[PDB]
C-alpha cells in the first residue's frame, strides 16, 4: 500500500494506491490497478481504478467532488473519476514527463479549475495543469543542493502544501536528508529560498513523509530515517528531535483536529503516537497493527454521521492490507487550553534555537 | 478537594482513591516502573499547590522523600531529597513535615533519631541538622500561627520543642512511659497532646511551664497509636492498639486571649498576638539558659 | 549570572524550570543592587570593611551556585537523549562556576558515557539483524525504498556509521580528562570493533559489485535487439543489470567515498540512452500495435517493406554506436 488519501467530504470512502518500491523486484505483468474502499462493505472493494502502470500515489481533490489523481511508477500522471472509475480520463505525454516513479503528488486547491504538483527521485518537482497536459508541465525546477558552483540534482522524497501557508511556499524533502522551499513567482520563474538542515538538521536518510499542523502552519514535522524532527517556518536548524526508533520511520502527521499529537509509523510494524501536551520524553502509546511492515498512514480530515475528525487512521502495510483504527475519544478531542500550550512551548523552543 | 484520598502501605506502595467512586478500586497505583520506594511509607502528605495538576509527597524507610504528580492513567516520581558519615546504605525516615508559611523548607525525622531541615531547592544537601533526639523520632510538626517553631515525639520517651534558627531543643518533656506521638494544637498555638501507654496529656506553655494540665486514660486495655487534632472544634481523636478510634473533647479552661476576655478588639491579634506570645515565651527561655 | 537570565533551554517540562531559573536570577539581581551600594569600600586597604562584605556576598554566591547545580540536574534528568543533553552543557559551557559546577559536571560525564554505550550497542544489534537481510534481499530490508541492492547497503551502512559518529566528535570536546577515564576507554575500544565490522562489509560489497560492473559491461555491447514469440514482436533488449548499474553509479557519486574504472564513460552518456530508449520504444510500440491490426493479405508489400526496412536495423543495434537518431526518424516518416 504505497500511498493513502480520505474523501474531501468526509470520512466515508478511503482511496489507496499499490505499487513495489523495491527495485526490480515486481513481477514481469503484475496487476498494476489502484482501488477505493467504503466503509459499509470493506469485503471488497466499491470501485476500481485502472492504470496503464502501477499507481504510486494518489490523492482526493476537495475542489472536484470524486477526482483522484495519481503518479504511476513510469513518471506518467493520471487522473480518473471517483463514480465511474474504470480507465484513466487525463494522461500526461511518455517523453516530457520525468523519467523514475512519482514520490509524491499533491492537489492545488487553491485555483478555480484544480492544478496539481508532482515531485520524483529523479529530482525535478512540476507544477502540472489538469484541464491541459497539452506538452508536458508548466514549471520544470530541478532540486540543487548548496548553491555556489556544486550543483548536484538529488531526489525529491516529499511535498508538503498547505492553505494557510498560501499558494507561495511549497516544502520539498529530498533523497540527501535536507528540505528545500520552492517560492512560484509570476517574476522569476521560480525561486528555491530556505535550506533546512543544509548543516545540523540533515537526517541521516531520505525524508520520506513531511506535514504541518492545520492548528498552527508556522510548525511543520519531517519524519526521516529513525527520528522525527520539527522545524519552525523560518529557522534553519530543528527545534524538537523526538528519540530514535525500532526500525525507521515510513510516514508520519499531525492530528488535524488536535495541534499537540502526531502519530509516526515503524516499519517494524507498529504504529506510536507523540501527545506533546502530557509528556515530551516518552510515547503516549504505542500499538501493532501488522506483523508486515507500515508504508503509509492518513487522518480524516472533516467528520460526517458518527466519525468527527481526526478519529479514523487509515494505515498502508507492505503486505497490503488497509487498517482504519478509531482512536480513543481523549486523543481526537481538544483537552483544555491545548493550543494555548503547544503555542507557548514552540515559541519557547523558537528562543532556545535563536539563542 | 476533599475527595481525593492519599494513601501509603508496606511494600511502599502509593495508592490514590476517590470517596466521589462507587466501585471503591483505586484510582491510581504506584509500581516498579514508576520507581516506588521498598520497605514501607510511614508519613504521606498532599501539597496545598495546585498549579502544576495534584502534587503527593511520600517518605519511605528506604529514605526518599517521593514527590507524585496525577496524570490521566500513569503518575511520574519525583526524587526530592535524599536522607543519607560511616555507616552502609541510605539513613531511615519514619515522618517528614511541610512549612504553611514557606512551602520550600520542610522537616524530615529519621531512624537514626536526627531530625533535618530541608529545601525542595537543593536536593543533594541540607539547610540544618538538629543532634538532640537519641532514637527514631515518630512524628514531626511544626507549630500553627508562627514559623521555624516545631514538635517531635520520639521512641526516647521525651516530647522536644526545638526553634529552626537553634541547632538543639529549647524544651524538653520527659515522660517515663514511651512517647507514640506529639501533635500541635490547631486553634490556639502553645497547646500540644502527647499520647504514651494508656495516658493522652495536653500542655499549654501560657498556663504552665513544665507541669500537664491535663492527663486521662481514654481506653483501659490497649496502648495508644496515634492521636489526630480536629482544626474546627476543640475535638481531639486517639487511636488504639485494637483498631478502636476514641474522640475526646477538651475543657474549656484553656483558650486564646485569656488575659482578658475580648479586651483591645483585635482580630489581627488571632493570627498575631500568637505569633507574638511564643517568641515573648521563646525569649523567657534564652534567659533560663 | 547575567548569562543565565539569556538562557532559555525549553527542554521537556517547562516554565516551572524557567520560573525557578528566573526567581534565581532576581535573588541575585537584589544581592548586586546590595553590593553598588558601596557604602565606604572604595578599594581602602586600611579599611577592613570590604572584607566583611565579599565574606556577605561569597555567602550569597555560594548559595546561589547550589541552586544552580539543582535546576541544571533537573533539566539534564528531563530531555532523555545524548544529543538533547550535550545541548544543554553548550548553554551553560560560558556559565561553569569554576570547581563548584565541575564536581557536578564529573558525575554527569558518567552518566553520558553510559548512554552512549547503549545506543552503540543497540546500533550493533541492528546491524547484526539487518546484515543478514541486506545480503539476503528479503522484502522488510534495512535497504530504504528503491534504491539498488548494492548502493542500499553502502547507504544503510553509512547511515549507521555516520549516527555513532556524531557523539565521539562532542566528546573529544569535554575537559576534565575525559579521555584518562577508563570508561570512556572502554567505549571507544566497542566503537573500533564496530566501525571495522561495518568497513569490512562495505569492502565485500564493492569488490562484488566490480566484478559484477566487468560483467555488465560485456552484456551492453552484445545486447543488440531481441524479437520473440511467433508473432515478431521485437522490443528493447536493454539489460535490467545495466538499467540497476546506471542506478547504482548515481548513488556512488553522491556518498562520494569511492567511484568504479571506466564505468563514468556509460554513466555520461547513460542519459543520452535515456532519451533513445525511450525515442527508440516510441517506434517499437508503434510496430508491436502495426502487426496486430491487420485482418494485410490485402497490402503485404506495405508491411513487407516496413518488416525488410527493419529486418537490418536490429542486427545494426550495438550499444557500442548509437546512431539511432536517423533510423528512428526515417521509420517515423514511413510508420
Known amino acids: 500500500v504505497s500511498e493513502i488519501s480520505w474523501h474531501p467530504e468526509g470520512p466515508t470512502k478511503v482511496a489507496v494506491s499499490y505499487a513495489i518500491m523495491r527495485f526490480q523486484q515486481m513481477p514481469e505483468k503484475m496487476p498494476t490497478q489502484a482501488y477505493v474502499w467504503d466503509l459499509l462493505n470493506p469485503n471488497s472493494p466499491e470501485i476500481k481504478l485502472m492504470s496503464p502502470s502501477a499507481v504510486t500515489n494518489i490523492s482526493y481533490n476537495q475542489k472536484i467532488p470524486d477526482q483522484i489523481g495519481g503518479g504511476c511508477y513510469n513518471g506518467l500522471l493520471a487522473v480518473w473519476d471517483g463514480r465511474k472509475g474504470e480507465n484513466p480520463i ?19 486547491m487553491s485555483k478555480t479549475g484544480s492544478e496539481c504538483v508532482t515531485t520524483s527521485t529523479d529530482g525535478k518537482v512540476m507544477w502540472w495543469d489538469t484541464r491541459k497536459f497539452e506538452a508536458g508541465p508548466v514549471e520544470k525546477l530541478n532540486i540543487i543542493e548548496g548553491l555556489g558552483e556544486n550543483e548536484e540534482i538529488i531526489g525529491g522524497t516529499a511535498l508538503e502544501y498547505n492553505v494557510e501557508a498560501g499558494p507561495s511556499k511549497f516544502l520539498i524533502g529530498t533523497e540527501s536528508g535536507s528540505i528545500l522551499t520552492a517560492n512560484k513567482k509570476l517574476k522569476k520563474p521560480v525561486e528555491i529560498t530556505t535550506r533546512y538542515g543544509l548543516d545540523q538538521g540533515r537526517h541521516l536518510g531520505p525524508v520520506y513523509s513531511i506535514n504541518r499542523s492545520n492548528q498552527n502552519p508556522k510548525y511543520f514535522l519531517s519524519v526521516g530515517d529513525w527520528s522525527c524532527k520539527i522545524w519552525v517556518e523560518d529557522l534553519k536548524t530543528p527545534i524538537i528531535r523526538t528519540k530514535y526508533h525500532g526500525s525507521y520511520l515510513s510516514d508520519g502527521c499531525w492530528s488535524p483536529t488536535r495541534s499537540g499529537a502526531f502519530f509516526l509509523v515503524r516499519r517494524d510494524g507498529w504504529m506510536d503516537v507523540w501527545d506533546y501536551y502530557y509528556r515530551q520524553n516518552e510515547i503516549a502509546f504505542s500499538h501493532k497493527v501488522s506483523d508486515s511492515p507500515l508504508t503509509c498512514i492518513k487522518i480524516n480530515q472533516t467528520g460526517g454521521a458518527y466519525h468527527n475528525s481526526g478519529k479514523l487512521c487509515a494505515i498502508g502495510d507492505q503486505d497490503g492490507t488497509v487498517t482504519i483504527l478509531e482512536l480513543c475519544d481523549s486523543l481526537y478531542t ?20 535563536k539563542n | 478537594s476533599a475527595a481525593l484520598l492519599a494513601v501509603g502501605l508496606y511494600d511502599g506502595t502509593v495508592l490514590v482513591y476517590d470517596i466521589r467512586n462507587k466501585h471503591k478500586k483505586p484510582i491510581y497505583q504506584s509500581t516498579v516502573r514508576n520507581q516506588k520506594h521498598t520497605d514501607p511509607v510511614w508519613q504521606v502528605k498532599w501539597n496545598p499547590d495546585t498549579s502544576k495538576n495534584y502534587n503527593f509527597y511520600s517518605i519511605s524507610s528506604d529514605g526518599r522523600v517521593m514527590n507524585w504528580i496525577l496524570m490521566k492513567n500513569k503518575l511520574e516520581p519525583e526524587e526530592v531529597i535524599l536522607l543519607r558519615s560511616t555507616l552502609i546504605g541510605l539513613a531511615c525516615g519514619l515522618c517528614f513535615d511541610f512549612n504553611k508559611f514557606e512551602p520550600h523548607i520542610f522537616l524530615v525525622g529519621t531512624e537514626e533519631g536526627k531530625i533535618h531541615k530541608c529545601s525542595r531547592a537543593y536536593s543533594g544537601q541540607y539547610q540544618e541538622t538538629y543532634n538532640g533526639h537519641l532514637l527514631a523520632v515518630y512524628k514531626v510538626k511544626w507549630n500553627n500561627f508562627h514559623p521555624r517553631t516545631f514538635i517531635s515525639a520520639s521512641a526516647d520517651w521525651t516530647v522536644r520543642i526545638w526553634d529552626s534558627k537553634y541547632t538543639s531543643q529549647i524544651i524538653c518533656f520527659d515522660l517515663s512511659m514511651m512517647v507514640v506521638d506529639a501533635v500541635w494544637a490547631p486553634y490556639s498555638s502553645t497547646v500540644f497532646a502527647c499520647a504514651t501507654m494508656d495516658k493522652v496529656q495536653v500542655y499549654d506553655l501560657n498556663v504552665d511551664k513544665l507541669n500537664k494540665l491535663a492527663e486521662q486514660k481514654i481506653v483501659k486495655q490497649p496502648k495508644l497509636t496515634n492521636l489526630s487534632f480536629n482544626y474546627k472544634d476543640p475535638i481531639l481523636l486517639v487511636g488504639d492498639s485494637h483498631g478502636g478510634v476514641t474522640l475526646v473533647k477538651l475543657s474549656p479552661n484553656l483558650c486564646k486571649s485569656g488575659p482578658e476576655i475580648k479586651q483591645t478588639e483585635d482580630k489581627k491579634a ?17 534567659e533560663n539558659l | 549570572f547575567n548569562k543565565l537570565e539569556k538562557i532559555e533551554l525549553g527542554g521537556t517540562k517547562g516554565k516551572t524550570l524557567t520560573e525557578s531559573i528566573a526567581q534565581i536570577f532576581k535573588e541575585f539581581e537584589e544581592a548586586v543592587q546590595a553590593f553598588t551600594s558601596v557604602s565606604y569600600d572604595i578599594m581602602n586597604i586600611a579599611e577592613k570593611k570590604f572584607d566583611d562584605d565579599f565574606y556577605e556576598f561569597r555567602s550569597k554566591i555560594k548559595e546561589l551556585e547550589r541552586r544552580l547545580a539543582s535546576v ?46 547503549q545506543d552503540l550497542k543497540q546500533v550493533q544489534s541492528i546491524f547484526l539483524e539487518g546484515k543478514q537481510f541486506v545480503d539476503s534481499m528479503h522484502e522488510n530490508a534495512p535497504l530504504f525504498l528503491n534504491m539498488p541492492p548494492i548502493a542500499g547497503a553502502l547507504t544503510w551502512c553509512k547511515s549507521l556509521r555516520d549516527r555513532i559518529q556524531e557523539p565521539i566528535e562532542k566528546l573529544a570536546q569535554l575537559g576534565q580528562g575525559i579521555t584518562e577515564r577508563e570508561e570512556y576507554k572502554d567505549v571507544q575500544k566497542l566503537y573500533t570493533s564496530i566501525t571495522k565490522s561495518i568497513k569490512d562489509y562495505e569492502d565485500q560489497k564493492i569488490l562484488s559489485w566490480e ?44 556518498l562520494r567515498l569511492e567511484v568504479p574504472t571506466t564505468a563514468k564513460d556509460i554513466y555520461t552518456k547513460a542519459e543520452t540512452y535515456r532519451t533513445q530508449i525511450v525515442a527508440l520504444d516510441m517506434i517499437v510500440d508503434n510496430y508491436n500495435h502495426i502487426k496486430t491490426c491487420l485482418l494485410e493479405p490485402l497490402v503485404k508489400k506495405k508491411i513487407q517493406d516496413m518488416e525488410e526496412e527493419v529486418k537490418p536495423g536490429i542486427e545494426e543495434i550495438r550499444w557500442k554506436s548509437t546512431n539511432i537518431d536517423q533510423f528512428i526518424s526515417k521509420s517515423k516518416s514511413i510508420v
Open chain 1, 90 to 108: 487525463m494522461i500526461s505525454p511518455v517523453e516530457n514527463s520525468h523519467y523514475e516513479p512519482v514520490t509524491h503528488f499533491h492537489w492545488l
Open chain 1, 334 to 353: 481538544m483537552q483544555p487550553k491545548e493550543k494555548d500550550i503547544i503555542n507557548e512551548m514552540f515559541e519557547r523552543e523558537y528562543r532556545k534555537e
Open chain 2, 270 to 286: 488571632m493570627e498575631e498576638f500568637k505569633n507574638v506570645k511564643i517568641e515573648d515565651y521563646e525569649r523567657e527561655k534564652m
Open chain 3, 72 to 117: 541544571i540536574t533537573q533539566g539534564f534528568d528531563d530531555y532523555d537523549t545524548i544529543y538533547g543533553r550535550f545541548k544543554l552543557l553548550d548553554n551553560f559551557e560560558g556559565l561553569l562556576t569554576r570547581p563548584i559546577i565541575a564536581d557536578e559536571l564529573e558525575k554527569k560525564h558518567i552518566v553520558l558515557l553510559e548512554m552512549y554505550k
Open chain 3, 211 to 254: 566484478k559484477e560492473v566487468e560483467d555488465s559491461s560485456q552484456d551492453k555491447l552484445k545486447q543488440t535487439l531481441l524479437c520473440k514469440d511467433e508473432n515478431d514482436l521485437i522490443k528493447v533488449n536493454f539489460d535490467p543489470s545495466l538499467v540497476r548499474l546506471l542506478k547504482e553509479v548515481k548513488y556512488f557519486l553522491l
